[PDB]
Amino acid sequence: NLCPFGEVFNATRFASVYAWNRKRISNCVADYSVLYNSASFSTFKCYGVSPTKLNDLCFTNVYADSFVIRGDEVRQIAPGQTGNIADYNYKLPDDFTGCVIAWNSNNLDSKVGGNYNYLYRLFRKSNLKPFERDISTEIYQAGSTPCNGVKGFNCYFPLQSYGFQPTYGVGYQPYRVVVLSF
Amino acid sequence: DIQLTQSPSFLSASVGDRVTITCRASQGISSYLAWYQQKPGKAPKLLIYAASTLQSGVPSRFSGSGSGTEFTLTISSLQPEDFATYYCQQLNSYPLTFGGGTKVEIKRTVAAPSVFIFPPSDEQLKSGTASVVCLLNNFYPREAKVQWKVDNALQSGNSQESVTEQDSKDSTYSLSSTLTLSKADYEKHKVYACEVTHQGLSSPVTKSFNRGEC
Amino acid sequence: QVQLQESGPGLVKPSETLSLTCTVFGGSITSSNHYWVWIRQPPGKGLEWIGSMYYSGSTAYNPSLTNRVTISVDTSKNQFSLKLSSVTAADTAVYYCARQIGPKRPSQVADWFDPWGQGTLVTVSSASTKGPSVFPLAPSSKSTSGGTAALGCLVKDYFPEPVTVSWNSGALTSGVHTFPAVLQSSGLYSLSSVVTVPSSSLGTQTYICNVNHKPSNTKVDKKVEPKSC
Amino acid sequence: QVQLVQSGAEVKKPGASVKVSCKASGYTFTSYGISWVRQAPGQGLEWMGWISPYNGNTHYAQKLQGRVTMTTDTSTSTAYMELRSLRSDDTAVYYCARDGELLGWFDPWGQGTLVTVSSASTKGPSVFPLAPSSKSTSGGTAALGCLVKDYFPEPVTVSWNSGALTSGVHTFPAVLQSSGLYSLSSVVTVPSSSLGTQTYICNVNHKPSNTKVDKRVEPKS
Amino acid sequence: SVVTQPASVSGSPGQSITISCTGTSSDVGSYNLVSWYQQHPGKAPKLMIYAGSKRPSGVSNRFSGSKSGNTASLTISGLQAEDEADYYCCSYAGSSTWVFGGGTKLTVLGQPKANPTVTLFPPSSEELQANKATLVCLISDFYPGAVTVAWKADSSPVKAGVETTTPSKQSNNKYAASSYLSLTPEQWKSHRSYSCQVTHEGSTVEKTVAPTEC
Ligand SMILES: *[C@@H]1O[C@H](CO[C@@H]2O[C@@H](C)[C@@H](O)[C@@H](O)[C@@H]2O)[C@@H](O)[C@H](O)[C@H]1NC(C)=O
Ligand SMILES: [Cl-]
């Protein structure tokens, strides 16, 4: 049968980038032509494979990761990138084989007064390994003194909200991202 | 819900005085505050936003300041046209909320009222109801007393009053008192009078007419 | 210069649905940095925020108005509307439409209102609509030799509020006082509009009061002359 | 030894500003926070705010936002507290302390800096005689003294008979009037038998104005 | 201050006393971050307890801390004479904010009770010539160091124009305090007498002055 790419791209709600979702796609025939033959993608960057010739090379496994990030953070969803998202939320390996797909979701995910449900990790003691997922809400110590799970001063809660509002500039608007790994 | 408490509820200052209005928020909202001026019958007009940034097109005598929980709006030199109800608004959290408003009256010298009395028109008497209107024009302060006498019989229960908002140029008030009667009851008596007393009058003023007599 | 012109019925029976529309002038409603809002002011009370809307659909309503508030946008007509269902007398207020500036960055100071519509009074009542009768308030024959006299118009027995009164098609404003309406025991409103003019002009200058009562499609132009004996 | 040493006392008028320094030594200045706590005369401790010299982060008390600024100079291990728009009720001793941040302790504390905010200017005192009642001296003992009134700032010193008379002298601490000026009284108790043969002269010195007032105190007449 | 302490507590050399520190659920009952500070007159506060019950290196084991709900307690066993001082509790309140208690003056009863000597002076003739008038009430040689002063015009109480100092220890380890009553020369001559009432340990001693007739 056919692969469930509609379940991923057309989902009513996307995950926060710190808790990015991963759907393992197995035992199906993928119709990749329709995906690229869509003008509604503002980012469609493939690495190691050509988007037109997606069904001509070897298939390790097919993973579909999805989340929502800021507009000016889309440039971090790529190999070798640094920044808050690539270091502390979602990291692509240097030898990445797949495609990064993103589109503006301002009319879906931003609310008047702020949609605070979408979060990202702002602090961490070390960068994430490729494809590592971190959902811990332990208090982060930025100073010399311990915190003992208490929030204050140089002790920060590690997660921050985007608070998407539709009147934000495009750099702060929500973007839905789908990473296809092969 | 963020609640804004505006003090005072009312104030009365003279032209040229320095006026200060306070708005206290139930929590600290940094500098997320705006001030509005609402004149009678008009929509509120933006004066200050971000606590202290004056809106383009607002006189420089207006100014805002404050941070955290307490904010103040200051009119350095009160003008007659500044008669209004001023509102603060928090712009940090939803739902958006306003303060209760501070009504600013203008204080001026005592002004006696000009008094006029109007008989019911012949067109209205054709309808079966008679209205007798008494006008108190351009007086200060607002408090005035109007007695209706019909053949020297003091009336009560059949008159309603109405007072204009303070005039934006001389800061005076005006009052109208309407005496409502039936056409039959109106034709039974002759002398109609309203007697006016006020701070600016050293003795009562009585404007009267005779029913029928020119 | 952006302008807002609201419209809609000023009378709604109880349990019915209030409906008002605001038309934007001097600018498009598909603004990417502004919200379109509604604010109401009960007579003699303060301001209450009703809701805000982005042109593409998203809304934010006041939780104090339960689920009886709907705002909508008609991009093709540069309009946005308000619908308040199951109204009670507690909904009688002057309703304003306004433009709210939105933030462009996280934690940016915005959310103030500029500009505003002129305001539309909506009265929740089951009473029927009645237009006014306009009677003259003639200047007294006595008056003075060359001082100042007073004349006016009596606007009686109408419902609901409001009426508008002008003099000489707007060419007479100096000295005019239009009094707030009083609600008579009959349930109908009544007001008078007066003006002080020089006594010498009473024979040479005409005075017409222009009475408009939109709820009843009534327009009355009434001449106010000195009474003849 | 860990030690914090602050700047000298300051006298300010309403509307002015004061900047107090707090030099740290004996520990790693950046390994802890610095907090500022003040204490009005005879009142309690009031936490003003915290600043971390490590990253420069600050947080202030709600009743001081927009009016206090805390800074540090890591090169000299010195924290500063600036307080603008000074009003009279800012009269207090301003302490700094090594903050353990979230460890929940303030230790050790600086010695403190007195900041007196008053609308009054420097003024020498008026010295009035405190004469005892004729009934109060008929029992054998007499209490006579001097009222040192309306001076600023503190302190004044009172001696009696150029220092010769010391037994029975009791000089009381000053009081602060609503004018911002101080007043104190010094009293000496003597045998009533000496009221007619011994002379009692109080000597009031007020260094801030170089004022020395002598007043002879005689029984009520 | 959201955190409340008793204003005063006293004990005898040998007994144990407890100083309570009552806050709300969002400060004392939310974090184990209650610290205690001992402050002697004119000296900086000194840390005695941190983290509710821990003692820093150097503090005697007679001091201990505890907490029940929203109330922290400091308990000093075997009271000594150097334990007499002001004590303050401090707690985290969330959001990077500390809050101190109002403080508790602890008295170590270390010598017999002494009633105060009171001396009241009238205005001098020199001061009355300068259009001012001051009554000076001097209070000496009392223990424990705490008095309340009440002023009387004739037999009526006087509240306005009263300036009273805090108690201060004398060189003999008893205490002294003074209280001033500011009057106009007319208020001083219009009354028959003025009185200074000093209360100490429930006992009151009064002194009375009157305008001198000459
Ligand atoms: C994702 O959805 C695109 C558009 O969906 C269209 O509208 C919704 C309401 C449905 O009616 C759907 O059947 C319509 O096609 C599709 O064009 C696109 O193919 C979808 N993505 C995938 C991978 O199938
Ligand atoms: Cl505090």
Numbering used by the authors:
A (entry chain E): 334 to 515
B (entry chain L): 1 to 214
C (entry chain H): 1 to 229
D (entry chain C): 1 to 221
E (entry chain D): 2 to 215
Paper text:
Alpha-B.1.1.7, Beta-B.1.351, Gamma-P.1, and Delta-B.1.617.2 variants of SARS-CoV-2 express multiple mutations in the spike protein (S). The RBD mutations found in Alpha (N501Y), Beta (K417N, E484K, and N501Y), Gamma (K417T, E484K, and N501Y), and Delta (L452R and T478K) are located in or closely adjacent to the ACE2-interacting surface where they have the potential to modulate ACE2 interaction or disrupt the binding of neutralizing mAbs.
Beta-44 does not neutralize the Delta variant. Since there are no contacts close to Leu-452 of the RBD, sensitivity to Delta arises through contacts with residue 478, perhaps due to loss of hydrophobic interactions between the side chain CG1 and H3 residue Tyr-90 when residue 478 is mutated to Lys. For example, Beta-44, sensitive to L452R/T478K mutations, is perched adjacent to residue 478, while mAbs, Beta-20, -22, and -29 suggested to recognize an epitope related to residue 417 are tightly clustered atop this residue. Altering the pose allows the different length H3 loops to make similar contacts, while the H1 and H2 contact regions pivot round. Beta-6 and -54 are examples of the two classes of IgVH4-39 Beta mAbs, with the shorter loop Beta-6-like mAbs forming the major class.
